[PDB]
Write a protein that binds this DNA or RNA. Structure first.
Ligand SMILES: COc1cc([C@@H]2c3cc4c(cc3[C@@H](O[C@@H]3O[C@@H]5CO[C@@H](C)O[C@H]5[C@H](O)[C@H]3O)[C@H]3COC(=O)[C@H]23)OCO4)cc(OC)c1O
Ligand SMILES: COc1cc([C@@H]2c3cc4c(cc3[C@@H](O[C@@H]3O[C@@H]5CO[C@@H](C)O[C@H]5[C@H](O)[C@H]3O)[C@H]3COC(=O)[C@H]23)OCO4)cc(OC)c1O
Ligand SMILES: [Mg+2]
Ligand SMILES: [Mg+2]
Lengths: 775, 775
DNA sequence: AAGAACTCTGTAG
DNA sequence: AAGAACTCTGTAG
DNA sequence: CATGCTACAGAGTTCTT
DNA sequence: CATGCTACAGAGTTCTT
């Protein structure tokens, strides 16, 4: 808070207020205020003020209760959690406003410390839409008359700026779709420099002084419509399902006349802002938080995996977590933050009984934390180190499969793939619990024997249940059972009704009166468990104390209780057909729930009921990916073999060709062309680098004779040429094998999936025997 | 601080306390002390406790005053700064000690909350000797009887561990002298894995389990000698002059019998620890904070420059400060920290009037800070952008000169050069102020006309002062003047006695009574100037108020004073022959003090009196570097020309040689040898990569015929052969030019230094005209 | 009038 | 017997 | 160099009435 | 994602004492 000169004074109704979502915005606004000279309209430290929103603020909609409105008036009670928040009460004190007053007159408006609050956020997809969203939603929920009478204003900054050489006027485009339309209407992207500002601090000194010179412009007054209140309740309200039905549709872009009305006169309706920016943020947060059913993992997590694949390919040597996070932020264009990325890396590399990653993609060296703190006892990322689990990843996410995935394009540059679809569905093996903007994601691990039988029966034709499982595919029968995994769990799973329950085990010695529990349900970390068992009041009347002798990889907890209470828990706590008296006592029963909300590869939410739907949706994607990989391999291999044959023919012909007595490249190429040599680009044949079949053929119909030229002389020896003849023989044999894999009865790549299944389960067993540390 | 159970009770004399230098040691201690079950040693949080020293603490020697000792007893008064320090008073509260009591008897020691305190620091140069040194110096200064009886102990973790395959006992070597003594006494470094632990948190789980299995070992009790107190006064407290005379000698390594006495029975004398670890830290910090007189920049800054040279060589595109800092911490092995590196990068890339870097090595994009806050108002390293100043660096630190520098070896791997000696001495152009462990470094910029004349007269023989300046070299005459720079300074410099003074300029309007100052003394930050003038109580009655309208890269401050006080400052504040009444009143002067303490390339401190000594010491280094560059160029160029002539004549001969009808490499190489061909390694000739003359000749006496083999076939064309013939002609012309540069009269490479001087001054003029922002 | 406190600057923790 | 109350994860400001 | 309030959703104890 | 006490020397400007 930098108080203005005439703040809370006589001229205070003419002042403004700057609301900054970040300290980068704080730095930009400080620079703009310290400009000073040549700005008769650009305000100085006076009449400006300053307030930092502290990142994400909370909405009052889910906090207020609206109780005791039966007295003929609707009174709203602020939450006790809402009252003591620092940012909200800070902006209340700064603006000098009161909740009870309804600012329907000019005098109560003049009571305010500032004349207009002008928020200033980044133009990234969150922020404006989120921070503005919750901010003006809170303002609408408490003081709609401020928004109606023009008290809230947006400081809209350019997102993408394109400069033409010799001209100093920006195009200052504000949306990605507008920039795409301008690029398509333009003939070419020549004599133009394109700059992306994914944050306010990206602006330079000349940039900030140019945009602050016209500070009277680019400030937009918010207006409230009659239909805005319904949108405010829908996007920010207690009823989550009410937004579910409007998070499955998609963002409606603004019409050209609406944008013209916005830019001609700066009156932004709240309904349009909620429908565009807030909805776009909500869709983005759904996509960035809910895992993909093909991946089983978050977009950030798949970005981390792609960065690890690119980083540890050359060398699997040790790397620190902060360095690896910087690497994947630099190379995969992660423009969000650093310590969230480091936290995601740490959680991905964690491995212990009850950890969310049953099959982690990273080998971890350092203190990642055991099951006692649930991964919260992990150390700092600067000294914790991670390396790539080479065998598990190389069997589980094959590079040949990684070529043919769809890829996410960021600013015209390649980034992490759209999805890694693996040989076994990680949406089934992994297990975690996330919230999102409208949905919840919960999964529990299935055993790697039911899923293995299911996939093998679907793929192998020798399994007698292959036809039966295919009939289950067409008719949703689900004959084979799916059971929760028993790995790292000495308890027993039970099924009742439509729910699975996990049970810990206990030993009772009545002559010693110690309740010794050795296995506990597979998610609660045994320390929050003993804190929760220390907060139950009735159990305080029944026990004496709790001692924990549990080390890494094992659990044993001894409970001392009153000698006369040992039977009392029988009468007070109960022993139903599903749980025992002691299981009710120590809360060793745990019902496991599944909320199977996933994001489609297109981008939308798909809901599921059981894991059979997950498996039967994941199976076709691997089907056509194997199918496309096989004929891509066939085409690129026939191109490789014809190019190798051309090399051999030129090698055997150049002795009598005598091309050495030629001047330049054109004459040599003409001679090779009139000798009938095939011109094909060998740099697209030796290394194809994810080229589709039609574009590979259209690239290879033309080509260059550079494979004649770029071949080194050292291959002139006859033994080398015999080795290349043997290589040609092996390439033709591989072509025959690929062709006969294309024509097999069930589907192409039938036995192929068998050896990746065998390799994956062998590597899993190897890592499972040595605490995933391998070596 | 976590309280140990039964600590400060009946068993308090049997306790211990773990003193951790930071959270990195804290994580290892939280792991090792508990370690689950199987804990004979390393008690599971029993009688141990935990305290963090918070990095670096202060020492009590420079805080206490020892006043009023005339009453027959020496009483010591603790400083007000020492009393309210968090860490010291925290450890006082944890140990339950009192300053007044001298713990001679056993009951006073039993009063203590813990039986002993065991320090736990990294084994890095820093921390052991520094943090240990200050901690036990504070203990010695207040309670020597605790150290005498054995209250103070420390745990001595192994710095380097060598593992033999099939054997699970590490060698646990503690010093690098011991480590490379073992390496030289060993036959070979085979069947051995070497692990460096540059910090405690780098130990793994099995490593900390192995160390805590024998926790009763590796704990050493400190003992106080009669000669310890003198060394305590030498290294800490007192005066710099008392330690200067012992920071020029060097560390004395411990004898073998002393180390045997330490390891046989764990009684470490304080004198040996002070003489080895503390002195080694002092020398390291002297080398780390005092700039080299050749470079003008410290070890960290030259590390940053070398990392920038490696990073921006392939592409000079923009990189963030954090990404570049991570790059230089990775590739240049900066094992100290992260944010200090980023701060050093920011200070290196700063450029404004009065900034410490008159010729920065990095061009900047962002808010690095103007002259008003003195660079303290720079933004976060998250978004601030840096790039390499391509022209200035490429003319100023030549890559051909960068090849031949000596290099710092870190763990057998190359790192930043030992010194980046430039074509013009940055120890003269730059200006800054650094304290260190015994010395102070202050410099003031000289103008780029006196130094240009000096260097040109030393180098160019056409300058009539060349012989006179050489006579000044042999006789220390220093005929040519050296003056402080006037760049970015509208004031005037004056010389009185042996000191230069910088003056601000002022305009007086007596009818308007406003003191308008437009330029203040060299390097005074605008803000502080006003805060310090606002603290002077005697000048409060003489002024009314102060206002500042100064924008970036300009100064104008208006002072309003009392109308009757305008003459009063004439009488009370005198106007001497050297200063005006107004200059004395507004403190518009500044005396330019210079403390020319530099570090030698060997490592020692060298002191200077004037900048002529700096110039005359820097000149010979460039002399032999140009000379050795000329021999290296001549040798590698004659090898290149014989290699090129060989390839040309072999292309001409292979038509009738007919080597294609040969089987393998050995037969082909034998045929080439029997035809009289010279085997020389073309990968050592095309790219020499800093090979000295003798080792280059000894590598090139042998070699390989791979240049026959690794040549691509595409060069078979006759126009290519004519191009390589022209290239051979140009190489021979360059050989002739190099040979005639070697034989010129003053020294080899005479006119060479003329064109780098011309290029450097042209690039400097370009930077000056563009505010060091070339684009 | 002499002497104890109090900041500064880079490189560390 | 209903409701307010507080955690609990993985990505983000 | 560890850390600190928040969103979002859904259930499960727990306190509290 | 800003920030907080420290070392080290030496030369100052206020502070009393
Ligand atoms: C003061 O205004 C600002 C606030 C922030 C927040 C922030 C806010 C906090 C706070 C802590 C944080 C902290 O977040 C931490 O990140 C962790 C990483 O993600 C997941 C894994 O877990 C997160 C923690 O839950 C969270 O605590 C900052 C890290 O980067 C951010 O984006 C965070 O504790 C108090 O309020 C950023 C700013 O710069 C734009 C601001 O100007
Ligand atoms: C909580 O974690 C720890 C932090 C620290 C210190 C530290 C200590 C501080 C403090 C701040 C800092 C902070 O930097 C300070 O500011 C300076 C700013 O100019 C740069 C050039 O040099 C920085 C120094 O490094 C340090 O003087 C940390 C940065 O890296 C460190 O190592 C610093 O303010 C209060 O006490 C030590 C630890 O034990 C080993 C820790 O466990
Ligand atoms: Mg942002
Ligand atoms: Mg260290």
């Amino acid at each position: 808070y930098t108080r203005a000169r005439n703040a809370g004074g006589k001229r205070a109704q003419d002042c403004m207020l700057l609301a900054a979502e970040g300290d980068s915005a704080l730095s930009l606004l400080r620079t703009g205020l310290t400009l000073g000279k040549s700005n008769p309209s650009g305000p100085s430290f006076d009449f400006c003020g300053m307030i930092s929103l502290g990142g994400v603020i909370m909405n009052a909609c889910k906090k207020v209760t609206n109780i005791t409105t039966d007295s003929g008036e609707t009174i709203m009670v602020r939450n006790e959690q809402l009252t003591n928040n620092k940012v909200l009460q800070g902006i209340v004190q700064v603006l000098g406003l009161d909740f009870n007053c309804h600012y329907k007159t000019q005098e109560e408006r003049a009571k305010l410390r500032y004349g207009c609050i002008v928020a200033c956020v980044d133009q990234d997809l969150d922020g404006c839409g989120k921070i503005l969203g919750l901010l003006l939603a809170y303002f609408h929920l408490f003081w709609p008359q401020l928004i109606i009478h023009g008290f809230v204003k947006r400081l809209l900054t350019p997102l993408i700026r394109v400069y033409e050489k010799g001209k100093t006027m920006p195009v200052e485009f504000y949306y990605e779709q507008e920039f795409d339309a301008w690029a398509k209407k333009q003939t070419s992207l020549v004599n133009h420099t394109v700059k992306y500002y994914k944050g306010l601090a990206a602006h330079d000194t000349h940039e900030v002084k140019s945009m602050f010179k016209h500070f009277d412009n680019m400030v937009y007054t918010f207006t409230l419509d009659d239909s805005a209140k319904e949108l405010f309740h829908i996007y920010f309200g207690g009823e989550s399902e009410l937004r579910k039905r409007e998070l499955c549709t998609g963002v409606v872009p603004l019409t050209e006349t609406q944008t013209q009305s916005i830019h001609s006169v700066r009156r932004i309706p709240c309904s349009l802002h909620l429908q565009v920016d807030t909805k776009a943020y909500k869709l983005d947060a759904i996509e960035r938080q809910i895992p993909n059913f093909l991946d089983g993992m978050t977009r950030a997590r798949r970005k981390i995996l792609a960065g690890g694949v690119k980083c540890f390919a050359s060398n699997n040597r040790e790397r620190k977590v902060f360095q690896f996070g910087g690497y994947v932020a630099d190379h995969m264009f992660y423009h969000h933050g650093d310590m969230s990325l480091n936290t995601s890396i740490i959680k991905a590399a964690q491995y212990y009984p009850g950890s969310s990653h049953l099959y982690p993609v990273f080998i971890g060296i350092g203190s990642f934390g055991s099951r006692h703190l649930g991964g919260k006892d992990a150390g700092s990322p600067r000294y914790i180190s991670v390396q790539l689990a080479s065998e598990f990843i190389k069997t589980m996410f094959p590079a040949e499969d990684s070529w043919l995935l769809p890829y996410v394009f960021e600013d015209g540059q390649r980034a992490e793939p759209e999805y890694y679809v693996p040989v076994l569905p990680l949406a089934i093996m992994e297990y975690g619990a996330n919230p999102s903007e409208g949905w919840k994601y919960t999964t529990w691990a299935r055993q790697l024997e039911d899923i293995l039988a299911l996939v093998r029966a679907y793929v192998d034709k020798d399994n007698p249940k292959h036809e039966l499982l295919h009939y289950a595919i067409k008719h949703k029968i689900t004959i084979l059972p799916l059971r929760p995994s028993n790995y790292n769990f000495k308890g027993h799973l039970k099924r009742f009704g439509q729910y699975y329950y996990s049970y810990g085990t206990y030993d009772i010695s009545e002559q010693r009166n110690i309740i010794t529990i050795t296995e506990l349900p597979l998610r609660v970390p045994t320390v929050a468990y003993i804190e929760s068992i220390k907060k139950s009041s009735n159990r305080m009347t029944f026990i004496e104390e709790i001692i924990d002798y549990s080390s890494s990889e094992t659990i044993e907890i001894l409970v001392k209780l009153k000698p006369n209470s040992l039977n009392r828990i029988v009468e007070e706590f109960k022993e139903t057909e599903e749980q025992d008296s002691i299981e009710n006592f120590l809360r060793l029963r745990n019902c496991l729930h599944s909320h199977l909300n996933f994001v489609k590869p297109k981008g939308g939410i798909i809901e599921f009921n059981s894991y059979y739907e997950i498996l039967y949706a994941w199976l076709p994607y691997r089907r056509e990916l194997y199918q496309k990989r096989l004929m891509r391999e066939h085409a690129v291999l026939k191109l490789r073999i014809i190019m190798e044959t051309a090399i051999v023919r030129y090698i055997n012909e150049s002795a009598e060709l005598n091309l050495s007595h030629y001047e330049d490249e054109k004459e040599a190429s003409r001679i090779l062309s009139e000798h009938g040599f095939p011109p094909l680009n060998h740099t697209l044949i030796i290394s194809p680098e994810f080229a589709s079949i039609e574009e590979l053929n259209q690239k290879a119909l033309q080509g260059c004779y550079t494979y004649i030229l770029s071949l080194q002389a050292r291959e002139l020896l006859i033994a080398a040429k015999t080795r290349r003849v043997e290589k040609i023989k092996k390439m033709q044999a591989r072509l025959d094998k690929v062709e006969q894999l294309l024509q097999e009865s069930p589907f192409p790549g039938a036995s192929v999936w068998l050896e990746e299944i065998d390799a994956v389960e062998k590597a899993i067993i190897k890592g499972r025997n040595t605490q995933w540390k391998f070596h």
